[PDB]
């Protein structure tokens, strides 16, 4: 069995190996990469996402989200308070202000310490989930707006044609902006490219151990667990590495830098934080190996998780018993 300790693997594809996306994902899995839940891919030196980022300040962040925490430093939830619209140039200036900027630090490890000590006492503002792309149309390799669609994968594997579309999303971050513990919708893969700026630290639980994280989360957030049998789908709960280690939960950590891709694998729980002003692009995708995970994915039916149009068909075809209840949650 490859990668039996479920370590995060880092890949350095050549320009030739960067041509065929599906083939390279399958290669990484042949080496056991998926056992970690997360892999890093460093693009060949010949590749670029676009020529420059000099012209992005006029992108609008229609609904910036202030991420307000509740709880204790290592075990907290966050809610998202909507703020007034601002441009990427305005948000970058905000990120760099004395109130929001990254503090002095020695290295990534000191910064991580400071994040977990102090996160709850601040409310950073995240420009998340903005439909769009920063890849140049002429970038042919690993262009997250030109990937094979999940609808087409489901049709190829299962024969059934379904409605829905699959497009990327932009994320503009600042110091302490946080992504809560989650798997993807329908336990899909994700791919995330850090276009520019400061790093993103990730934490991940191996897919084979995801239920251990779920059981801890039920213990640590007992009201939320009574409210919903899949409350991690709400994407609000944070648990620190120290608390995970105290509770024996297997996990790994890695820091992504500008110019690097991360892939999350089906049912790989992940969480993390941004080091300073940055911009990432991410999209979900599927492979043949996903279908069995999609059939087994949990679902929130309490009403909180509220998701895209395209998830309807995935539930309807892969999970027909659950469909009626899940759709009640959507309506």
**281 near 144, Cβ under 8 Å?**
yes
99 has binding-site annotation: no
Total number of residues that touch Ni ion (CB under 5 A) = 1
Which helix (H) or strand (E) segment holds residue 192: the answer is: strand 189-197
User: Which residues are CB-contacts of 14 (< 8 A; sequence separation ≥ 6)?
Assistant: 44
Helical H runs in the chain? 21-30, 88-95, 108-118, 150-158, 210-220, 222-227, 241-246, 290-296, 311-318, 320-330
Q: Minimal distance in Å, beta carbon 83 to ligand OGA?
A: 17
114 has binding-site annotation: no
Which residue is nearest to Ni ion, using beta carbons?
190
6 has binding-site annotation: no
In the list 61, 125, 228, 263, the residue contacting Zn ion (rule: CB under 5 A) is 228
- Does position 179 interact with ligand OGA (CB under 6 A)? The reply is yes
Q: Which is nearer to Ni ion, 133 or 190 (CB)?
A: 190
Q: 123 vs 113, 191, 236, CA distance in Å?
A: 17, 27, 14
- Counting other chains too, the contacts that 239-248 makes at CB distance below 8 Å and 24 or more residues apart are 239/74, 239/75, 239/181, 239/213, 239/271, 240/73, 240/74, 240/75, 240/116, 241/116, 241/203, 242/74, 242/116, 243/74, 243/75, 244/203, 244/213, 244/216, 247/216, 248/212
228 has binding-site annotation: yes
Q: What angle do CA 256, 257, 261 make, to 5 degrees?
A: 60
For the chain, the distance separating the N- and C-terminal CA atoms, rounded to the nearest angstrom, is 44
Q: Which is nearer to ligand OGA, 34 or 270 (CB)?
A: 270
In the list 78, 141, 192, 298, the residue contacting ligand OGA (rule: CB under 6 A) is 192
Q: Which is nearer to Ni ion, 50 or 289 (CB)?
A: 289
34 has binding-site annotation: no
Q: What tokens were used for 190?
A: 């994700």
48 has binding-site annotation: no
270 has binding-site annotation: yes
Q: Minimal distance in Å, beta carbon 57 to Mg ion?
A: 5
234 has binding-site annotation: yes
Stretch that binds Ni ion, among 90-98, 100-108, 187-195, 289-297 (CB under 5 A): 187-195
In the list 67, 190, 224, 240, the residue contacting ligand OGA (rule: CB under 6 A) is 190
Closest CA to 188 of 286, 297, 299, 319: 286
Q: Which is nearer to Zn ion, 15 or 327 (CB)?
A: 327
Site string for Zn ion, 294-313 (x = CB under 5 A): ------x-x-x---------
Q: Which is nearer to ligand OGA, 133 or 264 (CB)?
A: 264
Instruction: Please give the annotated binding residues for Zn(2+), written as ranges.
Output: 228, 234, 300, 302
Enumerate binding residues for Zn ion (CB under 5 A).
Answer: 228, 300, 302, 304
Enumerate binding residues for Ni ion (CB under 5 A).
Answer: 190
Enumerate binding residues for ligand OGA (CB under 6 A).
Answer: 171, 179, 190, 192, 264, 270, 280, 282
Instruction: Please give the annotated binding residues for Fe cation, written as ranges.
Output: 182, 184, 270
């Amino acid at each position: 069995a490859q990668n039996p300790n479920c370590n995060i693997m880092i890949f350095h594809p050549t320009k030739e190996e960067f041509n065929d996306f599906d083939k390279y994902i399958a290669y990484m899995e042949s080496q056991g990469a998926h056992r970690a839940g997360l892999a890093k891919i460093i693009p060949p030196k010949e590749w670029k996402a676009r020529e420059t980022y000099d012209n992005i300040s006029e992108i609008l962040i229609a609904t910036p989200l202030q991420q307000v925490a509740s709880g204790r430093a290592g075990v907290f939830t966050q809610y998202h308070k909507k703020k007034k619209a601002m441009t990427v140039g305005e948000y970058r200036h905000l990120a760099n202000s004395k109130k929001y900027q990254t503090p002095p630090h020695q290295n990534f490890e000191d910064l991580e310490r400071k994040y977990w000590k102090n996160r709850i006492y601040n409310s950073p503002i995240y420009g998340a989930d903005i439909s769009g792309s920063l890849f140049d149309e002429n970038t042919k390799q690993w262009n997250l707006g030109h990937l094979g669609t999940i609808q087409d994968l489901l049709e190829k594997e299962c024969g059934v044609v379904i409605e829905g579309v699959n497009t990327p999303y932009l994320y503009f971050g600042m110091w302490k902006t946080t992504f809560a513990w989650h798997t993807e919708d329908m336990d899909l893969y994700s791919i995330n490219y850090l276009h520019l700026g400061e790093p993103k630290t990730w934490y991940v639980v191996p897919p084979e151990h995801g239920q251990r994280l779920e059981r801890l989360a039920r213990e640590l957030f007992p009201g939320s667990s009574r409210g919903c049998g899949a409350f991690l789908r709400h994407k609000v709960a944070l648990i620190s590495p120290t608390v995970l280690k105290e509770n024996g939960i297997p996990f790994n950590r890695i820091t992504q830098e500008a110019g690097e891709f991360m892939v999350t694998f089906p049912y790989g729980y992940h969480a993390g934080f941004n080091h300073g002003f940055n911009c990432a692009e991410a999209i979900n995708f599927a492979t043949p190996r996903w279908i069995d995970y999609g059939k087994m994915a949990s679902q929130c039916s309490c009403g909180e998780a509220r998701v895209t149009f395209s998830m309807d068909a995935f539930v309807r075809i892969l999970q027909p018993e659950r469909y009626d209840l899940w759709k009640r949650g959507q309506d």
